[PDB]
Design an enzyme around this catalytic site. Structure first.
Site, short mmCIF file in Angstrom:
data_model
loop_
_atom_site.label_atom_id
_atom_site.label_comp_id
_atom_site.label_asym_id
_atom_site.label_seq_id
_atom_site.Cartn_x
_atom_site.Cartn_y
_atom_site.Cartn_z
N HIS A 29 0.87 -1.21 0.13
CA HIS A 29 -0.16 0.04 0.29
C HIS A 29 0.92 1.34 -0.20
CE1 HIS A 29 -3.76 2.28 1.61
NE2 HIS A 29 -2.65 2.88 1.90
N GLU A 30 2.08 1.23 0.77
CA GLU A 30 2.81 2.31 0.95
C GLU A 30 3.81 2.30 -0.27
OE1 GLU A 30 2.37 4.50 3.42
OE2 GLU A 30 0.69 3.05 4.12
N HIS A 55 -10.56 14.90 14.09
CA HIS A 55 -10.50 15.60 12.74
C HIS A 55 -11.39 16.97 13.08
CE1 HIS A 55 -9.77 11.55 12.05
NE2 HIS A 55 -9.02 12.00 10.99
N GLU A 101 -4.53 7.60 -1.25
CA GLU A 101 -4.77 6.49 -0.45
C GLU A 101 -5.74 5.45 -1.15
OE1 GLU A 101 -2.69 5.84 3.17
OE2 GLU A 101 -4.62 5.21 2.86
N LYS A 108 -27.86 11.70 13.03
CA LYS A 108 -27.09 10.25 13.08
C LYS A 108 -28.38 9.40 13.29
CE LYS A 108 -22.81 10.51 15.39
NZ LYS A 108 -21.83 9.89 14.78
N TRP A 133 -27.43 17.39 15.12
CA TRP A 133 -26.42 16.28 15.22
C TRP A 133 -27.06 14.97 15.27
CZ3 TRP A 133 -21.66 15.04 13.63
CH2 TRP A 133 -21.02 14.09 14.28
#
Ligand SMILES: *[C@@H]1O[C@H](CO)[C@@H](O)[C@H](O)[C@H]1NC(C)=O
Ligand SMILES: *[C@@H]1O[C@H](CO)[C@@H](O)[C@H](O)[C@H]1NC(C)=O
Ligand SMILES: *[C@@H]1O[C@H](CO)[C@@H](O)[C@H](O)[C@H]1NC(C)=O
Ligand SMILES: *[C@@H]1O[C@H](CO)[C@@H](O)[C@H](O)[C@H]1NC(C)=O
Ligand SMILES: *[C@@H]1O[C@H](CO)[C@@H](O)[C@H](O)[C@H]1NC(C)=O
Lengths: 195, 596
Positions: free
Chosen positions: B356-357, B487, B384, B463, B459
């Site tokens: 992957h890298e 994040h 990615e 959800k 919110w």
């Protein structure tokens, strides 16, 4: 009375490409075997000259121009090529007769933290004429505004430094180059092969 | 003469100075990451500072060339990437406050700790400890203490800061000619392009919403199946027609259901395929692992790795006495310097990580034919996804057979295939709702469509309706729960994880059609396909040089996201899930709550 090629190829210090060094090989006997034998050379291309027939022949002058560029630029040292190096540093004519030799210098010309002593000309108002040399430091005026020697907006110092760190890739690595120009006309031949 | 000429000259000077200053930052950043010392902290900090100071100066200078008079789109792209500065438009007193908020929110997240009412001295941090509970515990109340405590001790502290953060960030975007911070973020998907390859920042929402529509039936059935299996684990607190309690989803937020696998496994008697023991029995090492990975790219027509890679990379924990960062990172240090730092162990997972890298390194290596500023992925989703298609092919039983880690006679059983596509769904399909809903909320707070008085009401409404997920404990506007995720407290866009995913499977489906694969896509290896690596390398070459629309079209044939690929990978499981959910309700009610 041999021709001193080991003074060009086996020199301890090489030049920057904008200040390329020229040596005259004249009135001497030439050992071309050293050149063709050595397998260190990663580039050995001749244009106009048959490497073997040189032993048979004589040329008035042989010029040995030496410089350091980076690997992905070595292709520019050839007739008809364009680029920063060809346009602003070292030009070969389209009717060039001679040989171009290069090799990897990372063992010598690279340094941990970088060796910024080898430079190149980033900007120039006109392309170099074949075998021209420009050692001027004048501030490159790209716009209509005069730079007044200080450098500023649209006004750049025209020479930039290569940075050579041993961990760079081959295309970003230092390559010592030698251009041998063979001149067979309009002067009395003085450099002869062993034949 | 013309402005475009001055710009080209400007750019040429930038590139020479930037490449060396960036490279020097990479080199100092590498020596800290492979030799954790205070001396190399300073030098990493100092080198990134000089480069950051240089980059800002050049951005301001770049604004001096007006993009309207730039006819060359490649020159235009480079100027554009440079010209965007950010908070520079804001007043300096404001800008210091914004970074004061930003640094406070990040430190609260990192130094936040929660304490169990039981033993008022055993307080635990997120990593490690709370995160362990939220991933490994099967106790309803233990997990609740963690989930609520995190949103209580840390989320309540972050609430006032986040409200200020929105106002300041919104002004910054409004000053930069964007409607809101959300529009600002959605410009990473904008493309001026030539004809048919333009993309509007508003059009991103359309395409995220039509595609998520199409993922929904698959998510519903995965959701119904997990609820049923969890009913056995938590019978007192799960309702068969209702949402799932947010503290029981396998991590602190329910961003991945990967750790519900022990409890949802379709065929628990059938074990998973793990070539770890083979590699140990064949005396494999880090060097062999990465050599097989290079061979995988060689097989498709791509570049060998560089000698520098082999000489200069950290492909094993140093020992010596050197403290190292062991998180798997592919680099591009600049100037043909391409390295990986992995503390590689002889495990199937690190075999798969290497592939992957080196798909990073290989993207890195193809786009290096590009101007410095046009040397990344076409968007934030491409890079990615390239790595991911490389773990997909290399874990197929056919690859693992051919390279000698699975016996030539291996039994591919339907049950082991289904048990696989579940673990994939729990990670890949699980997050696709979580992701969309986070970013819709943020986009809609930033647009002002969600009042501060209703933030955490919408919110949790959202959800419920979208993610199928319900609040263990009720929560008021003394809470910022959005922002108890990294994040959101550390000011990072999130839709990248959604966009990655749809691209991933579009890329694989097209590379596997060029390798003329017969059968289920979940079993495709592109190994030994020179044609596939051409198509792949025709994208990877471009970088951010052409519109991202055109980069997709060059692999996949299409200018936008299509979920038809993703769905076909998983269509095996869809069918199984539907029959396993036929005597079950599929979907949720927005009304049930564990507390009322
Ligand atoms: C440089 O030295 C080597 C070894 O001493 C010799 O083989 C070679 O001929 C020399 N090069 C030149 C150009 O004479
Ligand atoms: C680690 O850093 C120290 C300075 O902190 C340096 O002297 C030492 O050589 C470094 N070791 C390696 C192998 O990088
Ligand atoms: C844009 O500028 C680059 C500079 O390298 C040039 O090669 C290219 O042909 C120009 N034209 C376009 C539209 O790409
Ligand atoms: C790199 O690829 C070339 C071209 O096929 C191959 O001949 C060479 O052996 C490879 N390099 C390695 C793995 O040493
Ligand atoms: C590629 O072909 C070679 C030779 O046929 C074979 O040994 C190797 O296993 C193949 N690789 C894959 C995974 O197809």
């Amino acid at each position: 009375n041999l021709c001193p090629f080991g003074e060009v190829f086996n020199a301890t210090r090489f030049a920057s490409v904008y200040a390329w060094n020229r040596k005259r090989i004249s009135n001497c006997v030439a050992d071309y075997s050293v050149l063709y034998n050595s397998a260190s050379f990663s580039t050995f291309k001749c244009y106009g000259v048959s490497p073997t027939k040189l032993n048979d022949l004589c040329f008035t002058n042989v010029y040995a121009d030496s410089f350091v560029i980076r690997g992905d630029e070595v292709r520019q040292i050839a007739p008809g090529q364009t680029g920063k190096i060809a346009d602003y540093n070292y030009k070969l004519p389209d009717d060039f007769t001679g040989c171009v030799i290069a090799w990897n210098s990372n063992n010598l010309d690279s340094k941990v933290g970088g060796n910024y002593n080898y430079l190149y000309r980033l900007f120039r108002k006109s392309n170099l004429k074949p075998f021209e040399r420009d050692i001027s430091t004048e501030i490159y005026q790209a716009g209509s505004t005069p730079c007044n020697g200080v450098e500023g907006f649209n006004c750049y110092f025209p020479l930039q430094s290569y940075g050579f760190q041993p961990t760079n890739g081959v295309g970003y690595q230092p390559y010592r180059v030698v251009v041998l120009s063979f001149e067979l006309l309009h002067a009395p031949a003085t450099v002869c092969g062993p034949k | 003469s013309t402005t475009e000429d001055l710009a080209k000259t400007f750019l040429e000077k930038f590139n020479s100075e930037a490449e060396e200053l960036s490279h020097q930052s990479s080199l100092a950043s590498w020596s800290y990451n492979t030799n954790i010392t205070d001396e190399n902290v300073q030098k990493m900090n100092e080198a990134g500072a000089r480069w950051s100071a240089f980059y800002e100066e050049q951005c301001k200078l770049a604004k001096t060339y007006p993009l309207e008079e730039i006819q060359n789109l490649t020159v235009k792209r480079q100027l554009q990437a440079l010209q965007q500065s950010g908070s520079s438009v804001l007043s300096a007193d404001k800008s210091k406050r914004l970074n004061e908020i930003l640094n406070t929110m990040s430190t609260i997240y990192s130094t936040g700790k929660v304490c169990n009412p039981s033993n008022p001295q055993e307080c635990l941090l997120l990593e490690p400890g709370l995160d362990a509970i939220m991933e490994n515990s099967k106790d309803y109340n233990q997990r609740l203490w963690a989930w609520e405590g995190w949103r209580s001790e840390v989320g309540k502290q972050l609430r006032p800061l986040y409200e200020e953060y929105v106002v300041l960030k919104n002004e910054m975007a409004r000053a930069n000619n964007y409607e809101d911070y959300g529009d600002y973020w959605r410009g990473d998907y904008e493309a001026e392009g030539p004809s048919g390859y333009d993309y509007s920042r508003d059009q991103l929402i359309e395409d995220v919403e039509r595609t998520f529509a199409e993922i929904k039936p698959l998510y519903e059935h995965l959701h119904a199946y997990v609820r049923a299996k969890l009913m056995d684990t938590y019978p007192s607190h799960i309702n068969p027609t209702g949402c799932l309690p947010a503290h029981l989803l396998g991590d602190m937020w329910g961003r991945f259901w990967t750790n519900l696998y022990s409890l949802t496994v379709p065929f628990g008697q059938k074990p998973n395929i793990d070539v770890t023991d083979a590699m140990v029995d064949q005396s494999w090492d880090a060097k062999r692992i990465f050599e097989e990975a290079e061979k995988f790219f060689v097989s498709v027509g791509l570049p060998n790795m560089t000698q520098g890679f082999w000489e200069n990379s950290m492909l094993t924990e140093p020992g010596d006495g050197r403290k190292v960062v062991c998180h798997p990172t592919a680099w591009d240090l600049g100037k043909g310097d391409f390295r990986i730092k992995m503390c590689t162990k002889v495990t199937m997972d690190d075999f798969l990580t290497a592939h992957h890298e080196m798909g990073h390194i290989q993207y890195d290596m193809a786009y290096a034919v590009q101007p410095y500023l046009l040397r990344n992925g076409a968007n934030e989703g491409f890079h990615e996804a390239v790595g991911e298609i490389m773990s997909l092919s290399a874990a197929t039983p056919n690859h693992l057979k051919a390279i000698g880690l699975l016996p030539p006679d291996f039994y591919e059983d339907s049950e082991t295939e289904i048990n696989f596509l579940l673990k994939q769904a729990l990670t890949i399909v699980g997050t696709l709702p979580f992701t969309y809903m986070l970013e819709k909320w943020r986009w809609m707070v930033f647009k002002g469509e969600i009042p501060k008085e209703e933030w955490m009401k919408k919110w949790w409404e959202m959800k419920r309706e979208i993610v199928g997920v319900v609040e263990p404990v009720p929560h008021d506007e003394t809470y910022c729960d959005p922002a108890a995720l990294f994040h959101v407290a550390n000011d990072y866009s999130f839709i990248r994880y959604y966009t990655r995913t749809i691209y991933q499977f579009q890329f694989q489906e097209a590379l596997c059609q060029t390798a003329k694969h017969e059968g289920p896509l979940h079993k495709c290896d592109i190994s030994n396909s020179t044609e596939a690596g051409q198509k792949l390398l025709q994208m990877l070459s471009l970088g951010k040089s052409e519109p991202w629309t055109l980069a997709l079209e060059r692999i996949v044939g299409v200018k936008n996201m299509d979920v038809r690929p993703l769905l076909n990978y998983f269509e095996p499981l869809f069918t199984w899930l539907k029959d396993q959910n036929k005597n079950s309700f599929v979907g949720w009610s927005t009304n049930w709550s564990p507390y009322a």
